[PDB]
């Protein structure tokens, strides 16, 4: 989530005064080249380096990745609601996330570098196979980076993280 | 004149050694005497050939009334002949009229009285430089013990007539009545023989008087003097009715006890504890084992590990009564350099009853025992020495004495490999064998022998030393024999067997100089001159 | 699955030689781990992060590599390094281990001074027992075979020497009239006949071999002769307990001054680790023997001697017997059985149970009890080691989430469960087959070190009719 290790250089700037979604690239600044769903969407030659996705009210979504002088970074699955990606389902006030890779092995989940869905002491947070259920989703509290990983592996080794921002 | 070499015990010993003494050959030391225990224990002494040390004497009166002259062949500390200090009220040194060599020390004698007025200038002769006489001619005891001033030419104390035949104590030596500057010389020069000859009238020297023969246990030294015992560099040997102090042939016989018999009865090897008890030793009586525990060091015997540089203490051993087993030698040394001087390993005791010289499991290139000549009783095994080469060459039958003696020279470096590696005896060595790789370590020589070295040919015609071959040996000619190029320069040793003389020739003999001033027959000095032909003619 | 290849599969090297083991991965691996497995023991993590040495690993071991090639190096091979070395990858499940490199000594006893004694002697009172000590690997005629006794309930007591080259024996006054020691140089074996066996003569009689700067350098196995119907050195601590890691120090006192006349103090400390013959630790008052860790460091002067083990480890537990040989009869101390105070902090332990012999088709449940740490904070893994095969990963379970993952070969027959209230993980094996016979080991996985650091001792499972 907060760390860029594992080629997860793409992060969301949560220092916005207006409801605009800005993306940042953690690469040696020379020129940042941005991509969305594989296609190039911009080329920043020095000066600015953040990518503006527009107002959050337009529900920006897509697999965003950047690239400096090295090779492209891992994707950042953006999912706003105001390679196989994570599946997001909203039903009333319940948000359900589906792990893209479910080989049948132990699926674990983490939210902002914090484990979730393991303890049964949480009625509003259940983990059922490759599905993470979030009941009574709190926009300000439950939004952020999410990632699923198999027991024994490092979360940073995931093919990409999921950035969820939802008003329910 | 008879001669001599707890507080109570000191008094007894001194009264025992100095009671009858009339001339003291060493130093009369009168030290540590308790109160009221001395009674005329030494009164007749008349000449002490050394230093008088009368120190820490609590007795009131040490008579020493008759001591006439104390020689000073030594000193107390330096230029210190009479040492009277730290004692004693009366010391009537009435008779001491000259202390020839040394000075008199006065200090720490508050009770000594009437001696500060002794005119010591007469007593001491020309050694006043260290005359600390700080602590009226009278030595005490009222009258009749006066200093008898006499000084403030073979007579020392005084004269009893203008004759050298009658003098108190003679300055240098005294033949029978007359005072001589020196002894009658032992060897006299005769112009007929042109060589020194034993003089029947000559007498050896016993202390301060000349004696035809030295009585008691006295050995004649080289300088004619009859010392009590031979020096360190000499040995005692009897040829005539009087023994002589013959000069030692290198290290003289110092029979030590080896490992197994004596103080080293229970020692295991020649440990760092055992070694240094064998320094300057020859003819070790017993074995002389050098087992590996010597070099490792041992704890249950608590002996520190032996430094390899100390095994060279054993280089002096020129004979061994028991066995010599050298079962480990330092790996950095290529030849058994510690046992280079061994001459006979008589082998009365044998290791395991069999071997008398075993050199087992060492890493020496050559046995290096160049000097070994007889290995009398036991066998000889030289095995395991995986780098030993010039080994089987020596004829093992020649050195050993009993016909049953064997040799098991095995498992050493192979003969083919020894010759292929260029390690063969030097050419200047007879087919007998060679102890190593060098000419010196050869059993016997093809032609000559310049000492241990076996040279190709004696310097018969050309050479610096100009050898003259003899009994298959090169013997350096006498230096006066000038080298001659047409023929040999010397038929045989000595100055009278040479054709051409570098210096003058006196009779048959060639000498550096003609005999001049030498003592000859009839007690007459001899002087000879040289003619144009370098012949020394008698005057 | 990423395949791990170890080369060589078996290596023999002499003591001191540099030993190199290579591990090749079928795919680029981020990190490689190296484990040392002694015969009959569980795997012990030696290197993590492909270069980092685990706690207690001597610096003579090192790991290197990147991508698909990794190398494990032993700079100076030691006799205690005999074990099977395994490399393990963690980048992807299942965690794959190499076939294992069997490391042995090329020469060994071939040249190593190894004394072998008789042992296992039982006698009756008033009789005589004769014990031998076959000395091999050295010139049996060049070193004394001193024989030392350690009675139950007392420290080491010397019993006299013999210099097998000459047979000239010294003896101890407490047995001078009773025990006779004779050499047989031809067969290289010293012998000791103790006659008129008493009640207090039941002990272990060791045959040392007094070296250059040390007494009792290489000690025999020891012969326990059980028969039933002097500068005094006392060790100030006794049964002094310490915590694994905490520095310890056992003091020892001399009745007189043990500074020998030669100026070399023959004070020594020998550490009879449980079940092993005493082996020298401080060769003189201060010098440490060769092959002892730098942890053990004695000190002292005059009459009092103190031994300071700078960091007590698992292997240092055992009686340190202080011996002084500057006196004629070699006298030892009482010796302080330094022991681990059990817990001594986090007793990270995995206790395995539930093994045994089961029929084919039956079910067996294994249990792994975790202690000394938060059971829910680390993943518990199961590894199987078949007879003659390398380590095989079975699966793991996350105690905090219940997340389990299994190897495809056993996913349909084995079930991994856990009990957080008992800090115990369960490995349920259903429909057992003869191929499932082996040792099952439980291991704790530290996500921060990406290595299985704590392993259980293993539970043998035999599937036989």
Domains and CATH numbers, chain A: 1-82 (2.60.40.10), 83-168 (2.60.40.10)
Q: Chain C within 8 Å of A157 (Cβ-Cβ)?
A: yes
Residues of chain C contacting residue B266, judged by C-beta atoms under 8 Å apart = 168
CATH 2.10.220.10 fits domain B467-530 = yes
What approach was used to elucidate this structure? cryo-EM
> Is there a contact between C213 and B291 if contact means CB atoms under 8 Å apart?
no
Nearest to A14 by CA among A61, A62, A72, A53: A53
Token digits for A150?
Answer: 């198999």
Closest CA in chain C for residue B291: C142
What SS3 state is found at B312? helix
Residues, chain C, total? 465
Q: Which residue has the tokens 């001594």?
A: C344
CA distance B57 to B146: 23
- Residue C8: cis peptide before it, omega within 30 degrees of 0: yes
Backbone phi and psi for residue C122, each to the nearest 5 degrees, phi listed first: -125, 125
> Is residue B515 within 8 Å of residue B189, measured between CB atoms?
yes
Residue C187 makes CB contacts below 8 A (sequence gap 6+) with: C134
Q: Does B216 touch chain C (CB under 8 A)?
A: no
In terms of Cα–Cα distance, which of B199, B202, B198, B223 is closest to B213? B202
Closest listed residue to residue C378, CA positions, set C414, C348, C407: C348
C51 and C62 in contact (C-beta within 8 Å)?
A: yes
Best CA proximity match to C309, nearest among C260, C248, C253, C266: C248
The torsion angles phi and psi of B520, rounded to 5 degrees, stand at -120, -155
The architecture (CATH level 2) of C4-105 comes to Sandwich (2.60)
- The 3-state DSSP class for residue B308 equals helix
Among B276, B300, B328, pick the best mutation site for testing chain C contact (most C Cβ within 10 A).
B300
Chains with ≥3 CB–CB distances under 8 Å to C: A, B
Give the closest-approach CA distance of B394 to chain C in angstroms: 30
User: What are the beta bridge partners of residue B29?
Assistant: B53
Q: Is the dihedral of CA B165, B166, B169, B175 positive or negative?
A: positive
Contact B41, B34 (CB under 8 A): no
Neighboring chain B residues of C213 at a CB cutoff of 8 Å = 297, 299, 305
Q: B142 Cβ partners below 8 Å, 6+ apart? A: none
Q: How many CB atoms lie within 10 A of CB B5?
A: 10
Tell me B216's DSSP state.
S
B260 vs C contacts (CB less than 8 Å): none
Q: What is the residue whose two structure tokens read 């004149």?
A: B1
Q: In this structure, are residues B103 and B127 in contact, taking their beta carbons and an 8 Å threshold?
A: yes
Q: Using CB atoms, which residue from A105, A115, A118 is nearest to C405?
A: A105
Which residues on chain B are in Cβ contact (under 8 Å) with C165?
268, 291, 293
* Residue B17 near residue B41, CB atoms below 8 Å: no
CATH class held by domain B252-424: alpha beta
Q: Which residues pair with C34 in a beta bridge?
A: C47, C87
CB-nearest to B298 from C144, C168, C326 is C144
Q: Is the separation of the CB atoms in C52 and C451 below 8 Å?
A: no
Question: For the stretch B489-518, what's the b/e string if a residue is b when 16 or more beta carbons lie within 10 angstroms of its beta carbon?
Answer: bbeeebbbbbebbbbbbbbebbbeebbeee
Residue carrying the six token digits 């950047």:
A66
Q: A134: how many CB neighbours lie within 10 A of its CB?
A: 24
Where helices occur in B141-200 by DSSP H, the ranges are none
Contact C93 A153 (CB under 8 A): yes
Residue C455 at interface with chain A, using a CB cutoff of 8 Å:
no
**Out of B268, B302, B328, whose CB is closest to C266?**
B302
Name the helix (H) or strand (E) containing B74. Answer: none
Closest by CA position to C309, among listed C347, C348, C341, C271: C271
| Maximum Cα–Cα distance across chain C | 77
Q: What is the largest CA-CA distance in chain B?
A: 99
Nearest CA in chain B to C163: B268
| CA distance linking residue C451 with residue A156, whole number of Å | 17
| Phi (first) and psi of residue B465, to 5 degrees | -80, -20
CA–CA min distance C401, chain A (Å): 4
Helix (H, G, I), strand (E, B) or coil at B120: helix
Task: Give the torsion through C-alpha atoms of C89, C92, C95, C96, to 10 deg.
Answer: -60
Measure in Å the smallest separation between the Cα of C86 and chain A Cα atoms.
19
User: Per CATH, which fold does B183-247 belong to?
Assistant: 2.10.220
Q: Do B291 and C161 touch (CB under 8 A)?
A: no
A110 in contact with C, Cβ within 8 Å: no
Given CB atoms, is C52 within the 8 Å cutoff of chain B? no
Do β-strands B3-4 and C414-419 pair in parallel, antiparallel, or remain unpaired? unpaired
* Residue whose tokens read 């993470």: A132
Cβ-defined contact of C210 to B266 (cutoff 8 Å): no
Query: Who's near C377: CB < 8 A, 6+ residues apart?
Result: C400
Q: Is C166 on the interface with B (CB under 8 A)?
A: yes
Residue of C nearest to B305 (CA): C212
| Closest to C195 measured CA to CA, from C171, C165, C162 | C171
Residue of C nearest to A128 (CA): C403
Would the CB atoms of C405 and A118 count as touching at under 8 Å? no
A60 reaches C (C-beta below 8 A):
no
Quote the CA–CA distance of B224 and B242 in Å, as a whole number. 12
- Resolution of the PDB structure in angstroms: 3.3
Length of chain B: 539
Reduce the secondary structure of chain C to three states and give it as a string.
CCCEEEECCEEEECCCCCEEEEEEEEEEECCEEEEEECCCCCCEEEEECCCEECCCCCCCEEEEEEEEEEEEEECCCCHHHCEEEEEEECCCCCCEECCCEEEEECCHHHCCCEEEECCCEEECCCCCEEEEEEEECCCCCCCCCCEEEECCCCCEEECCCCCCCCCCCCCCCCCCCCEEEEEECCCCEEEEEECCCCCCCCEEEEECCCCCCCCCCCCCCCEEEEECCCCCEEECCCCCEECCCCCEEEEEEECCCCECCCCCECEEEEEECCCCCCCEEECCCCCECCCCCCCEEEEEECCEEEEEECCCCCCCCEEEEEEECCCCCCEECCCEEEEECCCCCCCCEEEEECCEEECCCCCEEEEEEEECCCHHHCEEEEEEECCCCCEEEEEEECCCCCCEEECCCCCCCEEEEEECCCCEEEEEECCCCHHHCEEEEEEEEECCCCEEEEECCCEEEEECC
* φ, ψ for residue B123, nearest 5 deg: -70, -50
Question: Is C31 near chain A, with CB under 8 Å?
Answer: no
Give the residue from chain C lying closest to A110, CA to CA: C401
φ and ψ of C225, to 5 deg: -105, 90
Which of C27, C45, C39 is closest to C86 using CA atoms?
C45
Cα C14 → chain centroid? 19
Q: Name the residue among B299, B303, B328 with its Cβ closest to that of C211.
A: B299
Q: Which residue has the tokens 């050959």?
A: B25
B285 forms beta bridges with B257
Burial classification of residue B319, based on how many CB atoms lie within 10 Å of its CB (0-12 exposed, 13-18 middle, 19 or more buried):
middle
Chains interfacing with A (3 or more CB pairs < 8 Å): C
Nearest-angstrom CA–CA distance, C14 and C81: 11
Q: Is the bond into C94 cis (omega within 30 degrees of 0)? A: yes
* Alpha helices (H) along B403-464: 415-420
Neighbours of C452 (CB within 10 A): 29
| Domain C114-227 shares a fold with domain C349-463 | yes
Residue with tokens 């089961």: C358
Two structure tokens written together for B183: 């002894």
Query: CB-CB: which of C91, C92, C396 is closest to A151?
Result: C396
Q: In chain B, what are the domain boundaries?
A: 3-130, 183-247, 252-424, 467-530
CA distance A22 to chain C (A): 32
CB contacts under 8 A, A 125-154 vs C, are 127, 150-154
With b for 16 or more beta-carbon neighbours within 10 A and e for fewer, the B179-207 pattern comes to bbeebbbbebbebeebbbeebeebbbbbb
Question: Judging by beta carbons within 10 Å of its beta carbon (0-12, 13-18, 19+), is residue A34 exposed, middle or buried?
Answer: buried
- Residue-level length of chain A: 168
CA distance B423 to B389: 7
Q: How far is it, in rounded angstroms, from Cα A112 to Cα C110?
A: 62
E strand or H helix that includes residue B482? none
Distance in angstroms (rounded) separating the CA atoms of residues B5 and B21: 9
Distance of CA C96 to the CA centre of its chain: 28
Cα separation, C176 vs C272, whole angstroms? 27
Please list every residue in chain C whose beta carbon sits closer than 8 Å to the beta carbon of residue A107.
Answer: 403
* Residue A118 touches chain C, beta carbons under 8 Å: yes
The answer to whether A151 and C398 have CB atoms below 8 angstroms apart is yes
User: For residues B153 and B167, what is the distance between their CA atoms, to the nearest angstrom?
Assistant: 10
Domain C233-340 CATH superfamily: Immunoglobulins (2.60.40.10)
In CATH, the architecture of C349-463 is: Sandwich (2.60)
Q: Tell whether B49 lies on the interface with C, counting CB pairs under 8 A.
A: no
Distance CA B490, CA C342 (A): 99
- Best of A152, A153, A157, A158 to disrupt the C interface (most C CBs within 10 Å) is A152
Q: What residue in C sits closest to B361 (Cα-Cα)?
A: C139
Q: Are strands B319-320 and B243-247 parallel, antiparallel or unpaired?
A: unpaired
Nearby residues of C321 by Cβ (< 8 Å), 6 or more positions away: C150, C155, C156, C269, C270, C271, C272, C278, C332, C333, C334, C335
CB nearest C404 (choices: A106, A117, A119) = A106
Contact (CB<8Å) A150/C405 = yes
Sorted by where each begins, the domain ranges of chain C are 4-105, 114-227, 233-340, 349-463
Judging by DSSP bridges, how do beta strands C101-105 and C10-13 pair with one another?
parallel
What tokens were used for C435? Answer: 């191929």
Tally of CB atoms within 10 A around B21: 21
- Give the nearest partner residue to A152 out of C93, C400, C411, using CB atoms: C93
Q: Which of C274, C289, C282, C288 is nearest to C322 (CA)?
A: C282
| Alpha carbon of B360: minimum distance to chain C alpha carbons (Å) | 12
**Number of CB pairs, chain A paired with chain C, less than 8 A apart:** 51
Fold of B3-130: 24 nucleotide stem-loop, u2 snrnp hairpin iv. U2 a'; Chain A (3.80.20)
Is residue C367 within 8 Å of C426, Cβ to Cβ?
yes
CA C246, CA B137: separation in Å to the nearest integer?
91
Q: Distance between CA atoms of B58 and A144, rounded to whole angstroms?
A: 113
What does the alpha-carbon distance between residue C251 and residue C236 come to, in Å, rounded to a whole number? Answer: 5
d(CA C225, CA C195): 12
Residue of B nearest to C263 (CA): B304
User: Residue C323: beta bridge partners?
Assistant: C268, C332
Element of type H or E holding B10: helix B7-18
Record the tokens describing residue C424, joined without a space.
Answer: 């115990």
- Contact between chain C and chain B (3 or more Cβ pairs less than 8 Å apart): yes
- Chain B residues in contact with C210 by the CB 8 A cut-off are 298-300
- Dist CA B399 CA C226 (whole Å): 59
What is the spatial distance between Cα C393 and Cα C385, in angstroms, rounded to a whole number? 9
Cite the DSSP H helix spans in B364-414.
Answer: 396-399
Pairing of strands C304-309, A125-128: unpaired
Q: Which of C142, C210, C264 lies closest to B300 in CB terms?
A: C210
Measured CA to CA, the distance from residue B370 to residue B373 in angstroms comes to 9
What CA–CA distance (Å, rounded) separates C324 from C330?
Answer: 6
**Range C14-17 contact pairs with CB under 8 angstroms and sequence separation of 24 or more:** C14/C77, C14/C105, C14/C106, C14/C107, C15/C77, C15/C78, C15/C79, C15/C105, C15/C107, C15/C108, C15/C112, C16/C76, C16/C77, C17/C76, C17/C77, C17/C106
Q: d(Cα A140, Cα A129) in Å, to the nearest integer?
A: 26
As a whole number of Å, the CA-based R_g of chain A is 16
* Whether the domain at B252-424 and the domain at B467-530 fall into the same CATH topology: no
Q: b/e map of B382-417 (b: 16 or more CB within 10 Å)?
A: bbbbeebbbbbbbebeebbeeeebebebeebbeeee
Rounded Cα distance between B361 and B327, Å, is 6
Beta bridge partners of C136: C114
H-helix or E-strand spanning residue B121? helix B120-123
- What six digits make up the tokens of C279? 């082996």
C380 touches chain A (CB under 8 A): no
In terms of CATH architecture, what is C114-227?
Sandwich (2.60)
- Residues in C closer than 8 angstroms to A152, CB to CB, are 90, 93, 95, 379, 381, 396, 405, 445
Query: What φ, ψ does residue B337 adopt, rounded to 5°?
Result: -70, -15
Touch of B by A (3+ CB pairs closer than 8 Å): no
d(CA B480, CA B490): 10
> Is the torsion defined by CA of B257, B262, B265, B271 positive or negative?
negative
- CA B219, distance to chain mean position in Å, is 13
DSSP A101-153: ---SS-EEEEETTEEES--TT-TTEEEETTEEEETT--HHHH-EEEEEEETTS
Nearest to B101 by CA among B133, B83, B125, B78: B125
In this structure, are strands A10-13 and A20-25 parallel, antiparallel, or unpaired? Answer: antiparallel
Q: C110 φ, ψ to 5°?
A: -50, -40
Pairing of strands C147-150, C203-207: antiparallel
Nearest CA distance, C289 vs chain B (angstrom): 15
Q: Is the dihedral of CA C194, C197, C199, C202 positive or negative?
A: positive
Do C93 and A107 count as a contact with CB atoms less than 8 A apart? no
Please report, for residues B93, B113, B152, the alpha-carbon distance to residue B148 in angstroms, rounded to integers and kept in the order given: 11, 18, 10
Cα–Cα distance for residue pair B304/C213, rounded to 1 Å: 8
| Inter-residue contact B269 to B259 (CB < 8 Å) | yes
């Amino acid at each position: 989530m907060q760390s860029i290790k594992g080629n997860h250089l793409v992060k969301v700037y949560d220092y916005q005064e207006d409801g605009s979604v800005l993306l940042t690239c953690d690469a040696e600044a020379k020129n940042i080249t941005w991509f969305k769903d594989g296609k190039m969407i911009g080329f920043l030659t020095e000066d600015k380096k953040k990518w503006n996705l527009g107002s959050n009210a337009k529900d920006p979504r897509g697999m965003y990745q950047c690239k400096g002088s090295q090779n492209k970074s891992k994707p950042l699955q953006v999912y706003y609601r105001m390679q196989t990606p994570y599946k997001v389902s909203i039903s009333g006030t319940t948000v359900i996330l589906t792990c893209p890779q479910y080989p049948g092995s132990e699926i674990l989940w983490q939210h902002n570098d914090k484990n979730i869905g393991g303890d049964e002491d949480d009625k509003n947070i259940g983990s059922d196979e490759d599905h993470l259920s979030l009941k009574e989703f709190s926009e300000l509290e439950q939004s952020g980076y999410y990632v699923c990983y198999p027991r024994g592996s490092k979360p940073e080794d995931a093919n990409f993280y999921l950035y969820l921002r939802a008003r329910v | 004149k008879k001669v001599c070499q707890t507080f109570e015990d000191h008094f007894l010993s001194l009264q025992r050694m100095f009671n009858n003494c009339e001339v003291v050959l060493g130093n009369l030391e009168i030290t540590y005497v308790q109160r009221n225990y001395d009674l005329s224990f030494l009164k007749t002494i008349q000449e002490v050939a050394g230093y008088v040390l009368i120190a820490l004497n609590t007795v009131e009166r040490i008579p020493l009334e008759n001591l006439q002259i104390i020689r000073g062949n030594m000193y107390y500390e330096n230029s210190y002949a009479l040492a009277v200090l730290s004692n004693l009220k009366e010391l009537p040194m009435r008779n001491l009229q000259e202390i020839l060599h040394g000075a008199v020390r006065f200090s720490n004698n508050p009770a000594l009285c009437n001696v500060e007025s002794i005119q010591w200038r007469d007593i001491v002769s020309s050694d006043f430089l260290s005359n600390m006489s700080m602590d009226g001619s009278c030595w005490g005891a009222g009258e009749e013990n006066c200093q008898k001033l006499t000084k403030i030419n073979q007579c020392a104390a005084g004269c009893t007539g203008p004759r050298e035949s009658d003098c108190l104590v003679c300055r240098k030596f005294r033949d029978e009545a007359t005072c001589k500057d020196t002894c009658p010389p032992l060897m006299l020069y005769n112009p007929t023989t042109y060589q020194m000859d034993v003089n029947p009238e000559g007498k050896y020297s016993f202390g301060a008087t000349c004696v035809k023969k030295c009585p008691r246990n006295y050995v004649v030294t080289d300088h004619g003097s009859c010392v009590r015992a031979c020096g360190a560099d000499s040995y005692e040997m009897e040829e005539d009715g009087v023994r002589k102090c013959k000069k030692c042939e290198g290290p003289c016989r110092k029979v030590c006890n080896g490992i197994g018999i004596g103080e080293f009865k229970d020692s295991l090897s020649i440990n760092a504890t055992n070694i240094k008890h064998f320094k300057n030793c020859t003819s070790i009586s017993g074995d002389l084992h050098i087992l590996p525990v010597a070099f490792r060091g041992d704890s249950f015997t608590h002996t520190p590990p032996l430094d390899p540089q100390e095994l060279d203490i054993l280089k002096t051993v020129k004979e061994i009564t028991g066995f010599l087993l050298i079962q480990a030698w330092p790996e950095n040394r290529t030849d058994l350099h510690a046992f280079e001087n061994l001459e006979i390993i008589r082998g009365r005791t044998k290791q395991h009853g069999q071997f008398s010289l075993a050199v087992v499991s060492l890493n020496i290139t050559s046995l290096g025992l160049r000097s070994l000549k007889e290995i009398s009783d036991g066998d000889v095994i030289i095995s395991g020495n995986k780098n030993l080469c010039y080994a089987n060459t020596i004829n093992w039958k020649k050195l050993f004495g009993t016909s049953g003696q064997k040799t098991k020279i095995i498992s050493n470096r192979g003969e083919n490999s020894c010759k292929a590696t260029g390690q063969v005896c030097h050419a200047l060595c007879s087919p007998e064998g060679c102890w190593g790789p060098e000419p010196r370590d050869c059993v016997s020589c093809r032609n000559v022998s310049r000492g241990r070295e076996c040279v190709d040919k004696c310097n018969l015609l050309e050479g610096e030393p100009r050898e003259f071959v003899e009994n298959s040996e090169c013997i350096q000619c006498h230096p006066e024999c000038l080298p001659q190029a047409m023929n040999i320069t010397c038929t045989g040793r000595g100055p009278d067997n040479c054709i051409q003389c570098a210096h003058y020739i006196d009779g048959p003999h060639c000498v550096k100089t003609c005999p001049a001033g030498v003592m000859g027959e009839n007690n007459t000095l001899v002087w000879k001159y040289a003619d144009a032909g370098h012949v020394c003619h008698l005057c | 699955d990423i395949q791990m290849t170890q080369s060589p599969s078996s290596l023999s090297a002499s003591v001191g030689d540099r030993v190199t083991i290579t591990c090749s991965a079928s795919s680029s691996v981020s990190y490689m781990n190296w484990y040392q497995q002694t015969p009959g023991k569980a795997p012990k993590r030696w290197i993590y992060d492909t270069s980092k040495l685990a706690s207690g690993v001597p610096s003579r071991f090192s790991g290197s590599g990147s991508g698909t090639d990794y190398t494990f190096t032993i700079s100076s091979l030691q006799p205690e390094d005999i074990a099977t070395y395994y490399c393990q990858q963690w980048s992807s499940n299942p965690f794959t281990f190499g076939q294992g490199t069997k490391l042995q000594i090329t020469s060994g006893g071939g040249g190593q001074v190894q004394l072998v004694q008789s042992g296992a002697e039982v006698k009756k009172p008033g009789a005589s027992v004769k014990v031998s000590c076959k000395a091999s690997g050295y010139t049996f005629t060049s070193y004394w075979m001193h024989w030392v006794r350690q009675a139950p309930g007392q420290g080491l007591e010397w019993m006299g020497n013999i210099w097998p080259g000459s047979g000239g024996t010294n003896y101890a006054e407490k047995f001078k009239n009773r025990v006779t020691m004779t050499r047989d140089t031809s067969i290289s074996t010293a012998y000791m006949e103790l006659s008129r066996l008493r009640s207090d003569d039941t002990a272990v009689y060791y045959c040392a071999r007094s070296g250059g700067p040390y007494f009792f350098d290489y000690w025999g196995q020891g012969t326990l002769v059980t028969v039933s119907s002097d500068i005094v050195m006392t060790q100030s601590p006794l049964s002094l307990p310490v915590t694994p890691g905490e520095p310890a120090s056992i003091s020892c006192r001399s009745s007189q001054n043990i500074v020998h006349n030669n100026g070399i103090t023959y004070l020594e400390w020998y550490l009879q680790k449980p079940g092993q013959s005493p082996q020298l630790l401080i060769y003189k008052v201060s010098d440490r023997f060769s092959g002892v860790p730098d942890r053990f460091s004695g000190s002292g002067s005059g009459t009092d001697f103190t031994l300071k083990i700078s960091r007590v480890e698992a292997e240092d537990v055992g009686v340190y017997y202080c011996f002084q040989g500057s006196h004629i009869p070699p006298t030892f101390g009482q010796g302080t059985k330094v022991e681990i105070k059990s817990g001594g902090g986090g007793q990270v332990q995995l206790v395995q149970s539930g093994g045994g012999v089961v029929q084919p088709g039956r079910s067996l449940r294994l249990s792994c009890k975790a202690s000394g740490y938060t059971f829910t904070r680390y993943t518990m893994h199961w590894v199987r080691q078949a007879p003659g095969k390398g380590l095989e990963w079975i699966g793991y379970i996350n105690p905090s989430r219940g997340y389990t993952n299994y190897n495809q070969k056993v996913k349909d027959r084995f079930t991994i469960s856990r009990d957080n209230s008992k800090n115990t993980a369960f490995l349920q094996m259903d429909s057992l087959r003869p191929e499932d016979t082996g040792v099952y080991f439980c291991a704790r996985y530290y996500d921060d070190h990406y290595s299985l650091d704590y392993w259980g001792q293993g539970t043998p499972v035999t599937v036989s009719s």
